[PDB]
Every structure is written in C-alpha cells, then in structure tokens.
Design a protein around this ligand. Structure first.
Ligand SMILES: COCC(=O)Nc1nc(-c2ccccc2)cs1
Ligand SMILES: *[C@@H]1O[C@H](CO)[C@@H](O)[C@H](O)[C@H]1NC(C)=O
Length: 342
C-alpha cells in the first residue's frame, strides 16, 4: 500500500477547490523515485465538466479519496510482479484536474473550476524533496493515457525545477504509456478542436521549445510526434500500434475500406516512432499497460517491457542482446502472439 498525503499548500487544488495530493510508499534503501500520473480523459467547457462532476467525481475532487492504494505493475514492490524497479520509492499522483496535466488556473469569481495539473505536479515534487527525494539519483516521471501525454508536457519542466532549486545531480527521465496520439482523419465524420478549446479554458501550458515553434497553435504540442522532438530529457515511449482510445476518437468500432484504414493507422504510428530510440510498440488492440498486473506478459521480438526498460537504464550509464527500440512490423491487430487476451 501507498499512503495518501494531501498537499500542505492548500492553494494547489483539484477541480472543485479541494486539496490535491499524492500516495507514497518509501524505500529508504533506494535512490530511485517513480512518480506516476493517473489518466482519465478530460473536459473542455462548463457543460461537459459539470457532467463529469456528477458521475466521475473522484477525477475532480479529493473529498472521497481513500487513504491507501495498492501498487500494481510498475508500482508494485514485489520482484515477481515488477522485475524492473521493485525496490524504488513509489508515488501515485491522482488525476483530479481534467486538463491532461496542463492547467495553471485557479477557481475564482469568473472560473467555476480550477485547472492546476501542471502546478499539482509542480508542488508534489517540492514536498517530496523534504521526504527523501533530495537524495535521489533518478526521478522517473511516468503516466498512462492522459497521464502519458502529461509526461510529455511536464518532464522538461520538472528537470528545470530541480536545477533552479539546486539539485543538479538528480537525473529526470520520462515514461509515456498510451499517450502518443495521431491527429489523423477519422473513419467516419474531432479531437484537435476539443484540445484547442480546452487550452483556452484551462490556461494550459506547453513546453517552451514546442511553444516557440508553433507560436494560437499550442494544441500541436499535445501530440507526441510533434512535441517529443523538442524535449531534452530522455523519454521512453510505450504505445500500442492499434490503441483503443485512438480508434474510439477515429469512430472505429471487416471489409476493404476499414481494413485499409486500420492498416494505414498502424503504418503511420510505426513511422512516427522510427527515430525514437527508446520505445516499445506491439501490434495489439489494447489501451494502457504499465500499472496493469500482467504487464510482464507482452513481448516484442522476444523482449518484454520490463526487460526493455532495464536495457534503457543500462544505456543511460548499443548493448548485446539487451535492446531498447522495439516496434512490431506486422500489420494487423494481434499478429503478435503475446498480445493481451483480456
Ligand atoms: C492529444 O490528446 C491528449 C489526450 O490525452 N487525449 C485522450 N483521449 C482520450 C479518449 C478520448 C475519447 C475516447 C476515449 C479516450 C483519453 S486521453
Ligand atoms: C502555494 O502554491 C501557489 C500556487 O502554486 C503559490 O502561488 C504559492 O507561492 C505557494 N505557497 C507556498 C507557501 O509555497
């Protein structure tokens, strides 16, 4: 179990003004720290945020949060569930800002909700330094789905924060799981407009180099293949080639037209990853993996995800039989036999 801590700075809040927080399990014999960003869609105006507050309130408030949480997958402390980082300090950061971890706006007389995702992170890091993060060797910022995109938007800001605060020895890295989306044409007739509206609603912030490239066009930086080239911190990318959330936004739920559509989607995703040296992309129909209990099962070219992440660690000290770039080439869902049956 990871135990809950509400933020001492109560001005950093969830959507409804309740305090944000984090769950922590601390491993005093380790100098590695894993900070995981929860996912769960987003909302982009008053009307659909109001709907989210009725039936998805734990994603908008801490008032009902439980006191402990079980670490699963990469957050597990058992070596046989987590071959990669079982002895690390574990942190789970709940997603209660509905802004893809990008907001920096408080609740006011003109704002019904607060969107503080970028600041919630910003602050979890601050309070953790007093609980042992000051002695870390590596800080891995991880996340799934909306949290995976949140890794891409925030990893360089965390690195900059620790540099100005006087901790140049902490190596900040990122692990983005199922947050590598394409702004492609739908199968039937959209995401990009929802993101554009969201940024204005949230006062959303994007990384500085990406902002300077696109200059009204900041929505571009929410898409993996466009923002990744601008990042300095090392980032490992985990992405199913046929992600279920990507197919949902494409209005896909088999004859020739749809066959070509699905094959072209895999090809395009595969193309966007070819210059990404640390990546794991199996040809499966699924969504999220790294905090799933059976995340050790899937393999690409005979290498599991826990092994590929270990090989990544070694590379940051090509390696013989310990690869870090693993992308399937076969063109149809579940042509990899190790894909989840679920
Ligand atoms: C660039 O976008 C950032 C992002 O996080 N987008 C997401 N989209 C979803 C989603 C949307 C519709 C149906 C199922 C899932 C989850 S997260
Ligand atoms: C609390 O957080 C807010 C928003 O991030 C910030 O303006 C303020 O300086 C913080 N207070 C303290 C005491 O750090």
């Amino acid at each position: 179990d990871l135990r809950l801590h509400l933020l001492l700075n109560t001005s950093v809040t969830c959507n409804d003004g309740s305090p944000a927080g984090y769950y922590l399990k601390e491993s005093r014999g380790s100098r590695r720290w894993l900070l995981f960003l929860e996912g769960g869609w987003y909302c982009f105006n008053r009307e659909n945020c109001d709907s989210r507050y009725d039936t998805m309130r734990r994603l908008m408030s801490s008032r009902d949060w439980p006191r402990t949480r079980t670490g699963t997958g990469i957050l597990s402390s058992q070596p046989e569930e987590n071959p990669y980082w079982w002895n690390a300090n574990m942190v789970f950061i709940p997603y209660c800002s509905s802004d893809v971890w990008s907001g920096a706006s408080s609740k006011s007389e003109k704002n019904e909700y607060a969107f503080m995702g970028a600041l919630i992170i910003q602050e979890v890091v601050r309070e953790l330094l007093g609980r042992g993060l000051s002695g870390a060797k590596v800080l891995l910022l991880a996340g799934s789905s909306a949290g995976g995109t949140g890794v891409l938007l925030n990893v360089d800001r965390v690195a900059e924060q620790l540099e100005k605060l006087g901790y140049p020895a902490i190596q900040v890295r990122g692990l983005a799981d199922s947050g590598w989306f394409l702004d492609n044409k739908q199968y039937r007739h959209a995401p990009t407009e929802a993101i554009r509206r969201g940024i204005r609603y949230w006062n959303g912030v994007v990384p500085e180099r990406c902002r300077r490239q696109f200059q009204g066009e900041e929505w571009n930086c929410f898409f993996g293949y466009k923002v990744y080239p601008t990042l300095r911190s090392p980032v490992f990318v985990v992405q199913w080639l046929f992600d279920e959330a990507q197919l949902t936004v494409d209005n896909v739920h088999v004859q020739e037209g749809l066959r070509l559509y699905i094959q072209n989607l895999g090809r395009e995703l595969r193309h966007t990853l070819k210059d990404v040296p640390a990546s794991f992309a199996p040809a499966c129909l699924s969504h999220e993996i790294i905090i799933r209990s059976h995340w050790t099962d899937v393999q690409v070219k005979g290498t599991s995800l826990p092994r590929a992440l270990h090989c990544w660690d070694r590379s940051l000290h090509p390696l013989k039989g310990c690869p870090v770039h693993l992308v399937d080439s076969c063109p149809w869902p579940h042509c990899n036999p190790s894909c989840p049956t679920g």
